[PDB]
Structure 1
Amino acid sequence: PVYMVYVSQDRLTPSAKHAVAKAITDAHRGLTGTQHFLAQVNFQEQPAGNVFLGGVQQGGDTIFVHGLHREGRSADLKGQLAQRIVDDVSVAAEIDRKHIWVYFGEMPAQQMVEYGRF
């Protein structure tokens, strides 16, 4: 998979970035088998105030996780995975769960090339 992680600049220390990457990676690994290859977590930082909810400028604690997945997993499994991401990122990023949005996009596995794939 690739997890694009949208966070405000400097909210995550180097240690926290590692912790959040671990939380997401371990979540994915925990809910998949040996078919799993490698999870990428790609942090995308922007200055605080670049997020608006209902038109209202936010203070910088929001995290949006956009997970790019292969097709085929059940709704129940994806639900468990999103839940685990919310729970574990909440701890790693030191934020209330309400600050976390998680969206999954699915693609045919054939058009997902990793580290020189298929």
Structure 2
Amino acid sequence: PVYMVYVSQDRLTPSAKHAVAKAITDAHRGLTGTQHFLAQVNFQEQPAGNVFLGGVQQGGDTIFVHGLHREGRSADLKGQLAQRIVDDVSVAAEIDRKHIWVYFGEMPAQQMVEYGRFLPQPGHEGEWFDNLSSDERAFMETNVD
């Protein structure tokens, strides 16, 4: 997956970012089985005041998570995952849950590429990982916390 995480500049220190990104990553791994290194968290910071709700300018406590996933998972599991992202980002960023917005979009695995390679259907990430070159396997596996 790619999780784009929209936040205000300086609301999250680098350690708070590490905390948020590891909580989203753990959630995704623990609920889907997808290996840690296939999950990107991509922080998009903007000056405070660029977020409006009902037309009202917000301080720096708004978080929007846009998760981009392969098709194939159940509504039940995606609900559980969205809920766990809300809870665990609330703890990790010390931000009340009421500030957190989370949207999941889905695409055919055949039109998504990570590390320059096409993804597989969910649940066949193991033999997909095994199919590819030793250099790629090594580069991927360094990307696990």
TM band (smaller chain) = over 0.9
Larger RCO (alpha carbons 8 Å, 6+ apart):
1
Cα deviation, residue 112, structure 1? 0.6
Corresponding residue of 1:31:
31
SS in 2 for 1:34: coil
Cα deviation, residue 34, structure 1? 5.2
Q: How many residues align?
A: 117
- Shift in alpha-carbon separation, 1:72–1:35, aligned structure 2, 3 A: farther
Please list every run of at least 4 consecutive aligned residues from structure 1 whose deviation after the TM superposition is greater than 3 angstroms. Answer: 34-37
SS in 1 for 2:38: coil
Alignment of structure 1 residues 1-118 onto 2, 5 Å: 1-33=1-33, 38-117=38-117
Quick one: distance in 1 between partners of 2:33 and 2:46? Answer: 34
- Which structure carries more helix by proportion? 2
- Shift in alpha-carbon separation, 1:14–1:56, aligned structure 2, 3 A: same
In percent, how many aligned pairs have the same letter? 100
| Runs of at least 5 residues in structure 1 that lack an aligned partner in the other structure | none
SS in 2 for 1:95: coil
| Runs of at least 5 residues in structure 2 that lack an aligned partner in the other structure | 118-145
- Shift in alpha-carbon separation, 1:57–1:34, aligned structure 2, 3 A: closer
Quick one: distance in 1 between partners of 2:34 and 2:52? Answer: 39
Cα deviation, residue 40, structure 1? 0.3
Query: Bigger shift: 32-41 or 98-107?
Result: 32-41
- Cα deviation code 1:65-108 (max 9, x no counterpart): 00000001000000000000000000111100000000000000
Kindly report the root-mean-square deviation, in angstroms, between the aligned alpha carbons of the 2 structures.
1.2
- Shift in alpha-carbon separation, 1:110–1:100, aligned structure 2, 3 A: same
Quick one: distance in 1 between partners of 2:35 and 2:89? Answer: 24
- Cα deviation code 1:25-84 (max 9, x no counterpart): 000001012577610000000001110000000111000000000001000000000000
Give 1 or 2 for the bigger CA radius of gyration.
2
- Shift in alpha-carbon separation, 1:75–1:14, aligned structure 2, 3 A: same
Query: Bigger shift: 25-34 or 75-84?
Result: 25-34
- Shift in alpha-carbon separation, 1:111–1:37, aligned structure 2, 3 A: farther
